[PDB]
Design a binder for this molecule. Structure first.
Ligand SMILES: C[C@@H](O)[C@H](NC(=O)c1ccc(-c2ccccc2)cc1)C(=O)NO
Ligand SMILES: [Zn+2]
Length: 301
């Protein structure tokens, strides 16, 4: 008789930071929103205020980060904040930003999960809608691949392939089944990362202006440059899982299914969502009026 309900924020919560790509200072405000609103970004620095729903149809650029666009108005680097929202099961929220990029914080979803849980969650008087994968859907480009597989729960598998001394062994693949593994404990703290030769190229072009060892793992030709080391033995692949969860949440609803990524990035993740949405026979919308019968579990609000 206990139904799985939609969730929003119990209180407003505020954060400040800098954009990884733009280097601009930005004020972030997360606000409660009504049932069936979904996640909506709002550029409050503009006149009039521009709202951009966090949906696959509004993705505009996918080079290095996922960017939402509406006309000429952009919201860059939404993936880590959306991963935190998805991890905590937030259905409805307003995300107000004073600039064109979500703050990078420490490069992970950790600060966002903590800010959300500090504000608390509010269950709403409406059933949470899930998108259930009924048939396999895959997208490929070159040697990159991203797949949705029917699965009674939610599971993300990812494999990276870097021919580099730091990237050897079993730490290049990971699978997380959220029926037994905690998004907060095992995925949320995984930071973004960049290779020194790529970073140098980006800096030569006056790009990635906000990036440093304070908000990213920096790896040169042989080692991790961050003095204090890694948060997980497999932090790099866990961050790709974090990215995939955030990019997947642009479907607008939590998924019941499995994602498998092989060298996939924001572009291929978004192509997978667009293929799934277009293949209506591959999915269905489902609700759980009895939480006992559900294959996905959310933490108490
Ligand atoms: C891991 C990869 O998918 C991506 N991150 C980057 O592309 C990236 C690019 C540049 C930096 C960087 C780090 C330090 C200084 C300058 C740039 C960090 C991450 C990412 O996390 N997208 O969400
Ligand atoms: Zn990322």
């Amino acid at each position: 008789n206990a139904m799985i309900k939609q969730r929003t924020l119990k209180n407003i919560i505020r954060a400040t930071g800098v954009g990884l790509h733009s280097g601009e200072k930005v004020y972030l405000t997360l606000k409660p929103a009504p049932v069936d609103t979904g996640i909506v970004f709002s550029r409050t620095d503009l006149d009039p205020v521009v709202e951009i729903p966090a949906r696959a149809e509004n993705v505009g650029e996918t080079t290095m980060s996922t960017t939402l666009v509406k006309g000429d108005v952009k919201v860059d680097t939404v993936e880590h904040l959306l991963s935190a929202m998805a991890g905590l099961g937030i259905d409805n929220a307003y995300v107000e930003l004073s600039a064109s990029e979500v703050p990078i914080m420490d490069g992970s979803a950790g600060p966002f999960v903590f800010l959300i849980q500090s504000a608390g969650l509010q269950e709403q008087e409406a059933a949470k809608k899930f998108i259930r994968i009924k048939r396999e859907v895959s997208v490929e480009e070159g040697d990159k691949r991203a797949v949705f597989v029917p699965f009674d729960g939610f599971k993300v598998s990812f494999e990276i392939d870097f021919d580099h001394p730091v990237f050897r062994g079993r730490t290049q693949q990971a699978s997380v089944d959220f029926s037994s593994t905690s998004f907060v404990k095992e995925v949320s703290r995984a930071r973004t990362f960049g290779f020194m030769r790529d970073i140098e190229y980006l800096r030569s072009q006056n790009l990635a202006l906000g990036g440093s060892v304070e908000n990213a793992i920096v790896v040169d030709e042989n080692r991790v440059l961050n003095e204090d080391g890694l948060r997980y033995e497999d932090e790099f692949v866990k961050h790709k899982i974090l990215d995939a969860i955030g990019d997947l949440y642009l479907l607008g609803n939590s998924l019941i299914g499995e994602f498998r990524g092989f060298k996939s990035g924001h572009a291929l993740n978004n192509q997978l969502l667009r293929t799934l949405i277009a293949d209506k026979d591959a999915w269905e919308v489902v609700t759980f009026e009895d939480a006992r019968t559900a294959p996905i579990s959310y933490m108490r609000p």
